[PDB]
Enzyme design. Structure first.
Site, PDB file in Angstrom:
ATOM      1  CB  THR C  46      -0.957   0.016   1.210  1.00  0.00           C
ATOM      2  OG1 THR C  46      -1.732  -1.186   1.208  1.00  0.00           O
ATOM      3  CG2 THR C  46      -1.895   1.214   1.148  1.00  0.00           C
ATOM      4  CE1 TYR C 135       0.869  -8.955   3.404  1.00  0.00           C
ATOM      5  CE2 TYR C 135       2.663  -7.491   2.750  1.00  0.00           C
ATOM      6  CZ  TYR C 135       1.322  -7.833   2.726  1.00  0.00           C
ATOM      7  OH  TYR C 135       0.438  -7.031   2.038  1.00  0.00           O
ATOM      8  CE  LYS C 163      -1.652  -7.110   5.403  1.00  0.00           C
ATOM      9  NZ  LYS C 163      -1.336  -6.231   4.251  1.00  0.00           N
TER      10      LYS C 163
END
Ligand code: LAI
Ligand code: LAI
Ligand code: LAI
Ligand code: LAI
Lengths: 296, 295, 294, 293
Positions: C46, C135, C163
């Protein structure tokens, strides 16, 4: 020659009448039509024969009629594969009874099966084939079954297996299979890469489009054998122009339509859920039929 | 030649014990390739471990290779990055260093629309200031799956002169050739080189060309002469090697063979790439000897 | 305290020339804090980190730290394909005082599971004590890990969280079942509510930037056993997510933030293109709605 | 009302792979006794794809005799062939089923239009019985977009959708677009999360041995008892973990066999038998379930 399964063999279509029932007269004409164009044999009851939208008795009927028409004239391979092992065994026994030269079975689909289960499935069908060589059929795109090279190696070395129809566009795997099995009969399954398939290791092929232009594939075999690469490419390109069209029209129905215009198939319909050919493609299909008749 | 067609080795990037560029080995590898009779080098691509190099490190390799081979063989600079701006910087450098062309993999990781991919290539072509662009299609690694129509659009963009097709789909290979009779089309998967050429490719770019580029040249010649048997025999020998390299790890496997060939000082790749498993050394060393005795 | 909670995946504001817009970055950090966010995940997808250089990523980490260190939790995503570059960012995260580091499974080149493990170990070492947040985002990385492999990764020395950007809620429950103490962040905003029910105890997401309170609300609603409220809030989030997917998520978020007087120039870096003008009315209206609601 | 928790019925076979009618009847009664809202017959779980048309019809007929009027009955009449599917739809009508269902035709690639006409034709033959569209991409290989699903569920005669997809974003989108649609969660292992996303019921294989647990999850969520819902889902998943290892259908049949419901726990070939190393766990599970409820 009497036992050789190597060669160019058409995946036979199943003509239906206006009521979606088997059109026996058209089936007989199609078998003869294939024999006349110099095809090495026929692969009957596979995907192209719309076997998966037919009952067991309907599949046996097709096998029996084709045998009456071609037994002896050309090689005959019966695809007896079903998801069910028992159903496959029944078709295998029928294939022997009718005098086919070999049987074949797609890896059972829909339900996930372990490799061991796939192996035992082939073993059981081979047993019921009572002597007829088995042609393992690898077609991951439709079956959803993805085999590794080691698994393919195990399958093609099972007692009773004499060939592999390789419907895969992976020519690295094609070469690896040939390297590991120098004597294995290896059929290229995607018509659109026939030439490259033979170069990688295949020693023949089985395909749907062979019904309308099998002589071209035979021409590719000859060309490569004589070292005439330019001719091999030219023929492959012409086949691919046709395959481009058939993929747009719908392969089986597109083929049946061309065969209809060639006076072979009375009604070019496929079974529901397959729909009819879109009217916009008829001019090209008619032109193709006209061209193939002129050529041949 | 006055064109980009040919057999081009995808250049590896030698590193030292500290994983820093081994300039001396890089220069040796370039000369080694030239000595093998390769038509050119594809620099800064996947094989050069560009994606684990900084922008300045990639530029350094471009400069050195240029100093070593400019004017001797064709040089294609792969300047692709996910970022357009970074790709443009490398394109400008490739131009300044005198490369014959630039190339760029479809930007990855982030999903981009086809229009964004087109604008990406246009921008890089602008920065290349005249050097032709070699579109690089490698879905297995990029995750970008282009349709035939999209590929047709990309290869017809102003400034594009070739396509490196790292795809095992030989139907698409033929379709591309059929739609673009004059397009320079490089086969990307070494293991299907012969079939790729038969399908329509008119050359190739590959990692294994570094240790046996002459075999691929031999396949080109064999097919040109209509000698199918020799083409197959050569492809088979290449595939036996490729089988091994895939087990050992391709880049490190090649660097190891090159090490035993007295070309690469330290056969290491950059982390996260690990070292070659010792159990493979005997085979890799034997291969190196085999290839040397073969020359 | 721990790392559990709702963390916004921070966007990186750029100026018309695609250079870092420090003023807007600072405004976005302060904005998130005001929304009551629990923390920030910095330098991830992001943040458009994959179209930034190492130096630019470090600059963002340094600036965000100066703005929020001590106020909210800070997770530095230091992942790169290169282990060495990842370690450099890890060291910087430590230097700037982040609470933890994170790294996406290295992509593009195929790496063995052992190489992935050594990659995380190397980064953890450079993080010099900071806990690692593994992740997992197969959709973007192309790396498909089995449950056993995920279990191995989350149990590596130094790993304190995961995550999970996966819509597989069976695997979410399995992960929670195997690791009752693991900090588990739901990664797909559009399934947040269901993700929490399956076992996630928090989440990290892009849309948290413009409506983090809604996710905080879902957490509260479920904790109070108020299912209908949780569903209503999730539905509202998905209506927005439906839109952002159409406009392009990052640029759509930046555009909304711009209409909220937070971001000066809502541009993403090329190859990302601009927002289709036909979507401005909807994005501006959404911005209006969100400001009032808050 | 078709909303609810319904078991995807298994088909018991004897040692020679033939239908074991007595065990089929016993399993139907067993499901009715554990409080199931209805049965989904002739689907994947019933091993319909390794059965002939007549065999599938036989099962539909027997199940109807055993449970019509007692619980809801949905007949999965789907085949690759439209004609075959229609024959089964007509039979389901004759036997008194409450609805019919059809998996998207597989193996051969079909256009969306062909898929739509396939459903229309079956709906026509169902002569009144509502259609339950069956979306299961993992097995069918047919990947539908949200728009295509919306088109299918809006077709005249369609009254529900069995959503065997783990995509809960799509699950929520379907619910948002169709407030009154009967939406069945298809993957047992995400049942709780599926309901939260929008599903208002479910159809699953494991309901045969622990349907009350799923009924409990529905109750727990309706009562705002998140803790209990999660606990129940976890217990279900511990079981699903085992079944996936053993082979789901045969694992279920084996448990049912130890509960004296199913005489012979075999599936039809190519399905193999359960690996004996798993029997201790399966026996323990059967013991646990019987003492549980
Ligand atoms: O068109 C169907 C398929 O593309 C087939 O030709 C390829 O997968 C070849 O790899
Ligand atoms: O090993 C790598 C790949 O399998 C490559 O050979 C194929 O993708 C070609 O279809
Ligand atoms: O829309 C994006 C994705 O489909 C996402 O919601 C799914 O992967 C989760 O099952
Ligand atoms: O195990 C079966 C499958 O993995 C299933 O859990 C997933 O598809 C759910 O998204």
């Amino acid at each position: 020659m009497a036992t050789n399964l190597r060669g160019v063999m058409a995946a036979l279509l199943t003509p239906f009448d206006q009521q979606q029932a088997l059109d026996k007269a058209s089936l007989r004409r199609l078998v003869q039509f294939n024999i006349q164009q110099g095809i090495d044999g026929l692969y009957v009851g596979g995907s192209t024969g719309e076997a998966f939208v037919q009952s067991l008795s309907e599949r046996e009927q097709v096998l029996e009629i084709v045998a009456e028409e071609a037994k002896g004239k050309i090689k005959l391979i019966a695809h007896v594969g079903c998801v069910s092992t028992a159903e496959s065994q029944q078709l295998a026994a029928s294939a022997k009874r009718y005098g086919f030269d070999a049987v074949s079975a797609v890896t059972p689909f829909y339900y996930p099966f372990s490799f061991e289960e796939h192996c035992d499935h082939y073993r059981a069908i081979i047993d019921s084939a009572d002597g007829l060589p088995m042609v393992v059929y690898n077609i991951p795109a439709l079956s959803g079954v993805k085999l590794t090279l080691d698994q393919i190696n195990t399958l093609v070395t099972l007692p009773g297996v004499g060939a592999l129809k390789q419907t895969s566009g992976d020519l690295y795997q094609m070469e690896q299979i040939r390297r590991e099995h120098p004597d294995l009969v290896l059929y290229n399954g995607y018509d659109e890469i026939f030439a490259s398939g033979l170069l990688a290791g295949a020693d023949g092929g089985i395909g749907s489009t062979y019904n309308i232009m099998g002589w071209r594939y035979q021409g590719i075999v000859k060309a490569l054998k004589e070292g005439d690469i330019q001719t091999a490419q030219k023929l492959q390109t012409e086949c691919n122009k046709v395959i481009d069209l058939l993929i747009k029209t719908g392969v089986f129905r597109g083929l049946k339509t061309v065969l209809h215009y060639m006076d072979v198939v009375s009604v070019p319909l496929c079974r529901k859920p397959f729909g009819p050919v879109d009217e916009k493609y008829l001019p090209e299909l008619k032109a193709l039929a006209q061209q193939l008749m002129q050529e041949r």
